[PDB]
Amino acid sequence: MAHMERFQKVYEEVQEFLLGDAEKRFEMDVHRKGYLKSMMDTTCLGGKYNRGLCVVDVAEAMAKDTQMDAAAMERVLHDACVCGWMIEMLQAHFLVEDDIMDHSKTRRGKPCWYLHPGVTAQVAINDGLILLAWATQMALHYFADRPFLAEVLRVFHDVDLTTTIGQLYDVTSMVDSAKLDAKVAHANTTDYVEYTPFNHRRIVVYKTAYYTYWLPLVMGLLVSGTLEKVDKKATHKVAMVMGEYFQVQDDVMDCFTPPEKLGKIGTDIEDAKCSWLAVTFLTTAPAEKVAEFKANYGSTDPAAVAVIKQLYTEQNLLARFEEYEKAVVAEVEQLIAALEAQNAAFAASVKVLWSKTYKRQK
Amino acid sequence: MAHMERFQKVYEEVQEFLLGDAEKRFEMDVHRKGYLKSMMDTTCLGGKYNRGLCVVDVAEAMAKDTQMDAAAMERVLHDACVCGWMIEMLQAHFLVEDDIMDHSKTRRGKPCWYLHPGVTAQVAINDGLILLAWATQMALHYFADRPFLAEVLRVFHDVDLTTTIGQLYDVTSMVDSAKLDAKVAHANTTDYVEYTPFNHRRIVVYKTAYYTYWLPLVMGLLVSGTLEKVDKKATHKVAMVMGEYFQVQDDVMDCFTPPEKLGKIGTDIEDAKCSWLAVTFLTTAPAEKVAEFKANYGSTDPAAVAVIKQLYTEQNLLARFEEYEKAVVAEVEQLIAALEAQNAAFAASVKVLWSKTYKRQK
Ligand SMILES: O=P(O)(O)C(O)(C[n+]1cccc(-c2ccccc2)c1)P(=O)(O)O
Ligand SMILES: O=P(O)(O)C(O)(C[n+]1cccc(-c2ccccc2)c1)P(=O)(O)O
Numbered sequence A, B: 001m002a003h004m005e006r007f008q009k010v011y012e013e014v015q016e017f018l019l020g021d022a023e024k025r026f027e028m029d030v031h032r033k034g035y036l037k038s039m040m041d042t043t044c045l046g047g048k049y050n051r052g053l054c055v056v057d058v059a060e061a062m063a064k065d066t067q068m069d070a071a072a073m074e075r076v077l078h079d080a081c082v083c084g085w086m087i088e089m090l091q092a093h094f095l096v097e098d099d100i101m102d103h104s105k106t107r108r109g110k111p112c113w114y115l116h117p118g119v120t121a122q123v124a125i126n127d128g129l130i131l132l133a134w135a136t137q138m139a140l141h142y143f144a145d146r147p148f149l150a151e152v153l154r155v156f157h158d159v160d161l162t163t164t165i166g167q168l169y170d171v172t173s174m175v176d177s178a179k180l181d182a183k184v185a186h187a188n189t190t191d192y193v194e195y196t197p198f199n200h201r202r203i204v205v206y207k208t209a210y211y212t213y214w215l216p217l218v219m220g221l222l223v224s225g226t227l228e229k230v231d232k233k234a235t236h237k238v239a240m241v242m243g244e245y246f247q248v249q250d251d252v253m254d255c256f257t258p259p260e261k262l263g264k265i266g267t268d269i270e271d272a273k274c275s276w277l278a279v280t281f282l283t284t285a286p287a288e289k290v291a292e293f294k295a296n297y298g299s300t301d302p303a304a305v306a307v308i309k310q311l312y313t314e315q316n317l318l319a320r321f322e323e324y325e326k327a328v329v330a331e332v333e334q335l336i337a338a339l340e341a342q343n344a345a346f347a348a349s350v351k352v353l354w355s356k357t358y359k360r361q362k
């Protein structure tokens, strides 16, 4: 990938800075520095880098479209990589905390961070907070004299909030919302009345689309000084459509992609998650199959899980996804065509992001 | 207190804004809005408000000093309250996450947030993230047109990082640091070689002094436009001295203050924490008593815990604390006197903060 080499070089630079700043400011010892390096590498590396690389792709596209000398181009590219790593570290933060919340086993082909024997959830919760803090530290340091510092902080923290609210929707989606009460425990739903297209869309848009699609695009624009050269409303809309689709893919793969290929072991079925599969099944399946689903969903029993996967196969959920996907490509291409009519350089960078998204296998 | 009524009014105002903003931006439903209101109230209220009210005390003192007119004074007081709630919500965030990490039972006289039957740690981890996000949201909204917004965000996030590094020191202090290895579990120490004055000071300065003492003081100066009026190094120094002492008090009270007065049930002894008591005991006790300590510390057995408390009592730990406190008083008074020679108004505000700290009972 065009910017992969540059992006990994900036990782090493940012890591050296962050760990060195801790030695300088917080009397960091050699052993905990080593721990923190291992934590950063394990939690921030090993993914696809779709988010981080997008920032760099967008920034370059927009910078090429402007007039600027070699030194200015180098600055935009370096700043873009730093911004990319801010988002990768925000991702790292979310996944550390998510893996604890989901009581998960594997992430990116390795044991989850909290599941490392020398860590535990008791330490990893705070390791996640360190990751989040580091992301802002990168902006404060590298962008100390840049005009876009304030706007970078604003959009980053807005998206942080947005994602935590999406996560709220996610973690509270298996209990009937009328029953949600801090003082009283409640069993998970038995009737699944709230497992609706609207409720699934609300979960995925806020928990995924903002930080995975909207944030990288906007940061690319901010570091290149071109945010005002694009249609804000249109950019948001295409980010939501692609981001919803990206999470739908994630939902589908939880059931249908081998964990060894995926690098993670999803338990959506065991945890009675309001996934795209669950919602699509419940709203399309015949009455007796809906009943059987309800009898078997949200159980850790392997036979119950196997019944759900077979019911999904019988209801042709993979084919139904392909129909959804066809509808999504149609909309995305239209939205991109509209963006292209306004700013062809930006629209090209949206195409690049979409191309890494469409029909992905992990 | 002078600003308690104003401060509580601003709470109601910021709460309405934050919940309203979620409705506007994230399609927040009535049930989850109610959940979030109860979460905010439970996690943000019921403390002493020393941090938040300090911001207002400092801002008022400096606004009077610089002869602000009625309209300017009202703005600074309202801004100060908002900054105060940023810190209270940062505190709320830390305590939510800490109660999970320490597996605690009570906070501020009520069950810990995660222990509310309708919550659990698996929801509460994210509730803590929401609180942290909300703190930045207040600044972005209320200070959108203020030139001090940049510096408020900078200091807030620097202190957030500092505190998480302090927390790293805290949670990794019961294992030999040379044995800190993500891939390998290691038992708690048996020799306690790292339970040193230096390591205790490092934990408490970073986990407590920055967010409890330095941050409220700096924010009061930032909102009143008076940071340039005071000695930065001297301010930092007095904040470190008071903050260390404040955490030493917290450590002492874990053992010697009844949970019902304190409002929380500490388990420093059961969890083999590197507390001021443990460190001071180990470095001053005769060898026979040190051996007894090692044979009983870090045990959940109530008799073992009682043995430790008896050892502390026999070693005159409370008297030793009183002697430390005398030395702190002497240093704080010297530092305040030097501040007073430079800016009397700010020195008075530090005196107010110190008066709420010195010989506190909870
Ligand atoms: O558990 P999910 O939801 O299926 C997953 O996609 C992670 N994820 C996605 C979006 C948001 C969050 C999230 C955001 C904030 C806080 C916690 C989690 C996690 P996974 O299949 O990769 O585990
Ligand atoms: O557990 P501690 O350390 O004794 C306590 O004082 C809370 N606290 C203090 C400082 C920092 C943090 C903290 C900061 C960041 C993350 C987690 C915890 C918690 P408690 O007696 O009130 O529980």
Ligand SMILES: C=C(C)CCOP(=O)(O)OP(=O)(O)O
Binding pocket: A046, A047, A048, A049, A050, A091, A108, A207, A208, A212, A246, A247, A250, A362
């Ligand atoms: C589905 C979401 C939003 C979480 C995983 O995101 P990715 O699939 O982008 O994970 P990495 O590439 O970062 O491993």
Ligand SMILES: C=C(C)CCOP(=O)(O)OP(=O)(O)O
Binding pocket: B046, B047, B048, B049, B050, B091, B108, B207, B208, B212, B246, B247, B250, B362
């Ligand atoms: C000792 C620390 C730093 C944690 C508790 O802080 P406080 O004792 O200030 O708690 P509240 O008043 O906020 O309850």
Ligand SMILES: [Ca+2]
Binding pocket: A098, A099, A102, A104
């Ligand atoms: Ca997960």
Ligand SMILES: [Ca+2]
Binding pocket: A098, A101, A102, A170
């Ligand atoms: Ca999850």
Ligand SMILES: [Ca+2]
Binding pocket: A250, A251, A254, A266
């Ligand atoms: Ca998933």
Ligand SMILES: [Ca+2]
Binding pocket: B098, B099, B102, B104
């Ligand atoms: Ca605690």
Ligand SMILES: [Ca+2]
Binding pocket: B098, B101, B102, B170
């Ligand atoms: Ca603790």
Ligand SMILES: [Ca+2]
Binding pocket: B250, B251, B254, B266
């Ligand atoms: Ca304590």
Ligand code: NA
Binding pocket: A254, A255, A266, A267, A268, A269, A270, A305
């Ligand atoms: Na499964």
Ligand code: NA
Binding pocket: B254, B255, B266, B267, B268, B269, B270, B305
């Ligand atoms: Na105890």
